[PDB]
Design a protein around this nucleic acid. Structure first.
Ligand SMILES: [Mg+2]
Ligand SMILES: [Mg+2]
Ligand SMILES: [Mg+2]
Length: 800
RNA sequence: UUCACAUUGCCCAAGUCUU
RNA sequence: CAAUGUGA
């Protein structure tokens, strides 16, 4: 239960399309290359500090040693020809404007054995060899540019992309080495992120405070100003000799004091310095408990410090405006980068005789046929998606819900959302509900204005007790408000009542499209079936009972230290497949492995049997958001968790488990080669484009599938990787199955970018995160209850 | 909080050392 | 899901 299956075959389905991928072929020599371990003392040093130490050491000891190594920034060094070593250590003493370095060889890396693994000759790809190659390609840019993850950022030359607040956009590129069916590939993609301007602190103060210039004013800052500035620069580094800021003094430099005495005076006396701006305070740097101080005038923000904090609304707006790029525009920016990059020239890439193609790799994809969507009513109409989109005009829900009892609760101000507005909104919504098959048969049995989160629970309690057979509460919200989270806390977890919130602006001015999409959510929440896949058009897997599981963990934002990660798992409850149920848990901070999966799957198998009266013969498990580096760890725990659930249920119940990891967030981009193939304004590849050759895995079962219409920017083709498959799918069937599952998403008449089960799992997790707002053993149980839905909500699609 | 797509935020990675 | 855009 620990090795992924081989690729069973290649797909044959769909018309072919010519594509270019942001992969660049690598020509690698077959040689033994020599790996050395390293030790640098002290070893609490930053990665970049260590690189310097090796850099000098290499030029200092050039005679009788090293007479062009690469270095991974910690303890691994690679050379193209052997050193004067053996397994003998060599204790070296290096100096840099006081370090000791150990160099003990470890092994030989065979680039020969890598040609084999890329062939059918060898079963496995040797990670240690791929690791080496990565260090080679990364060595130069890790010192020229500023690394962030697997990317590299630098201030663009001649361009300034200021964000305000003392920030600006830096442009960069992702870089990674990947084996493939064809060759080694250099994956390159352009990116941008926020950095702090290396301007004087004085100018940094200005932009943060919105001064046109300093001297406005020459009075000491208001505490409102001194605090806001404290928030911006604390934790940043500054140079005079670099230092990190840990505090901003309360008193001006003229009257701030320390035991050797005014800050102004020490610079006046010791350093011959009279300060232009005594009225302003001082940065406290170094150790918080020690008493070092610097005035702002003698300090610069040191370059290369990424902005870890969230951008403001306007900074975000600016950032997007800068990096927004249609697919051709994006294809051209990667291309220009690679020609410019001059990978071949790099002297370290040369030491290892590596050659990189300057042109994007050509790959042949296939564009799969969309499934037909069956509707109900008397029409029993069939929708046919064109380019990943269809519509509901002249169509009714497969199983529409008749709404007899419902209510409206308006938390928008009466002045702003009038009874006319609500009445007109009710008129149109009823018109669209009729055209849609989910007839709202009469006016609401209750319609009252309210205010504040305080009125929610009593209102909803009154409703539940007063109106028998109450199906729905429509809730009008003024905009962004804590009432929403409250409405859902009470509705989902406290009273178990269906609610549908609507922004006030979408009530004041309705449209047929918005109301149609709104009915999609309502009908589902009330137990309806919007549509189903054309039964006779489904893959053979449906000939027997099968459950489709979607799973996902959602972790806390950057910089957060204590919030839990939220695991969510959903399972199909019919043979369509359309109706899903959901389980959800809180678990350890930033743990990807779903800890309580067995319990979650058991719940779903039980409810599947209660809904369908079948026991699944197969389990198709779509698992979102696991990266290659976590495949084995995740699969081991979660495959065994699914078996565990099955085994503790009955007998020998051993359905076939297919384990698929879905990755939407990678750096593979696909482009149309021929301009006549590009779709829409964004110029993206068409919905259904499938790639399972050339750029994919050399031995294992994986494929790219872009299942959605690209509206804007460059589409992300979702990657699927089969980690386990008891059911022995062919490439065709699984690719078609995955694609058809993208058309079973109930919130829109579109093919979405990942399978509905996986998509729902996101919605579920995000809803759990909403139940926990401002609430995040005894700690665990408190949160565990916050995300536990009512008994009456368990079997619903409340998350729609 | 009508909805999708796109940018960022999420596991891996990255990150952390005389006033 | 939140912020920000493109769209229906
Ligand atoms: Mg995730
Ligand atoms: Mg780590
Ligand atoms: Mg949005």
């Amino acid at each position: 239960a620990f090795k992924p299956p081989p690729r069973p075959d290649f797909g044959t389905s769909g018309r072919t399309i010519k594509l270019q991928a942001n992969f660049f072929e690598m020509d690698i020599p077959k040689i033994d290359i020599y790996h050395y371990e390293l030790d640098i003392k002290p070893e609490k040093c930053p990665r970049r500090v260590n690189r310097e130490i090796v850099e000098h050491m290499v030029q200092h000891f050039k005679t009788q040693i090293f007479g062009k190594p690469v270095f991974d920034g910690r303890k691994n060094l690679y050379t193209a020809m052997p050193l004067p070593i053996g397994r003998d250590k060599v204790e070296l003493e290096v100096t840099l404007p006081i370090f000791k370095v150990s160099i003990k060889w470890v092994s030989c890396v065979s680039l020969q054995a890598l040609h084999d693994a890329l062939s059918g000759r060898l079963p496995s790809v040797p990670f240690e060899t791929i690791q080496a190659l990565d260090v080679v390609m990364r060595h130069l840019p890790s010192m020229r540019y500023t690394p962030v993850g697997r990317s590299f950022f630098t201030a663009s030359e001649g361009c300034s992309n200021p964000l305000g607040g003392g920030r600006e956009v830096w442009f960069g590129f992702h870089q990674s080495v990947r084996p493939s069916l064809w060759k080694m590939m250099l994956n390159i993609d352009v990116s941008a992120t926020a950095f702090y301007k290396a301007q004087p602190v004085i100018e940094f103060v200005c932009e943060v405070l919105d001064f046109k210039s300093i001297e406005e004013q020459q009075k000491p800052l208001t505490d409102s100003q001194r605090v806001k500035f404290t928030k911006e620069i604390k934790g940043l580094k500054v140079e005079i000799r670099k230092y990190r800021v840990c505090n901003v003094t309360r008193r001006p430099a003229s009257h701030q004091t320390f035991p050797l005495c005014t800050v102004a005076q020490y610079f006046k006396d010791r350093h011959k310095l009279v300060l232009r701006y005594p009225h302003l305070p001082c940065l406290q740097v170094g150790q918080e408990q020690k008493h070092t101080y610097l005035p702002l005038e003698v300090c610069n923000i040191v370059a290369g410090q990424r902005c870890i904090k969230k951008l403001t609304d306007n900074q975000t707006s600016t950032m997007i405006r800068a990096t927004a790029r249609s697919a051709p525009d994006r294809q051209e920016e990667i291309s220009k980068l690679m020609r410019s990059a001059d990978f071949n020239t790099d002297p370290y890439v040369r030491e290892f005789g590596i050659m990189v193609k300057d042109e994007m790799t050509d790959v042949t994809g296939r564009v799969l046929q969309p499934p037909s969507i069956l509707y109900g009513g008397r029409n029993k109409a069939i929708a046919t998606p064109v380019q990943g989109v269809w519509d509901m005009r002249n169509k009714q829900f497969h199983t529409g819900i008749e709404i007899k009892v419902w209510a409206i609760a308006c938390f928008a101000p009466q002045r702003q959302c009038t009874e006319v507005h609500l009445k007109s909104f009710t008129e149109q919504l009823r018109k669209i509900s009729r055209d849609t098959g989910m007839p709202i048969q009469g006016q609401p049995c209750f319609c009252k204005y309210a205010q504040g989160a305080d009125s929610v629970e009593p209102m909803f309690r009154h409703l539940k007790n007063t109106y028998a057979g109450l199906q729905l509460v429509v809730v009008i919200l003024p905009g962004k408000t804590p009432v929403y989270a409250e409405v859902k806390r009470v509705g989902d977890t406290v009273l178990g009542m269906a609610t549908q919130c609507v922004q006030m602006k979408n009530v004041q001015r309705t449209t047929p499209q918005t109301l149609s999409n709104l009915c999609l959510k309502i009908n589902v929440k009330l137990g309806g079936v919007n549509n189903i896949l054309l039964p006779q058009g489904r893959p053979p897997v449906f000939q027997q009972p099968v459950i489709f599981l979607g799973a996902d963990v959602t972790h806390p934002p950057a910089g957060d230290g204590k919030k839990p990660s939220i695991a969510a798992v959903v399972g199909s409850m019919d043979a369509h497949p359309n109706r899903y149920c959901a389980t959800v848990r809180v678990q350890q901070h930033r743990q990807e492995i779903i800890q309580d999966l067995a319990a979650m799957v058991r719940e779903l198998l039980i409810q599947f049997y209660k809904s369908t009266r079948f026991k699944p013969t197969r389990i198709i498990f779509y698992r979102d958001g696991v990266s290659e580096g976590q495949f084995q760890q995740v699969l081991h725990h979660e495959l065994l968790a699914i078996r565990e659930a099955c085994i503790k249920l009955e007998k020998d119940y051993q359905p076939g488990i297919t384990f698929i990891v879905v990755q939407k967030r990678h750096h593979t981009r696909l482009f149309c080669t021929d301009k006549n193939e590009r779709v829409g304004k964004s110029g993206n590849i068409p919905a259904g484009t499938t790639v399972d050759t050339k750029i994919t895995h050399p031995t294992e079962f994986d494929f790219y599938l872009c299942s959605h219409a690209g509206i804007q920017g460059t589409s992300r083709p979702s990657h699927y990787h089969v980690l386990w498959d008891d059911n022995r799918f062919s490439s065709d069937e699984l690719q078609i199955l995955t694609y058809q599952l993208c058309h079973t998403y109930v919130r829109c008449t579109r093919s979405v970018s990942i399978p509905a089960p996986a998509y729902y799992a996101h919605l579920v997790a995000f809803r759990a995160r909403y139940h926990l707002v401002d609430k995040e053993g005894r700690d665990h149980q408190a949160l565990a209850k916050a995300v536990q839905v009512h008994q009456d909500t368990l079997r619903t699609m409340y998350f729609a």
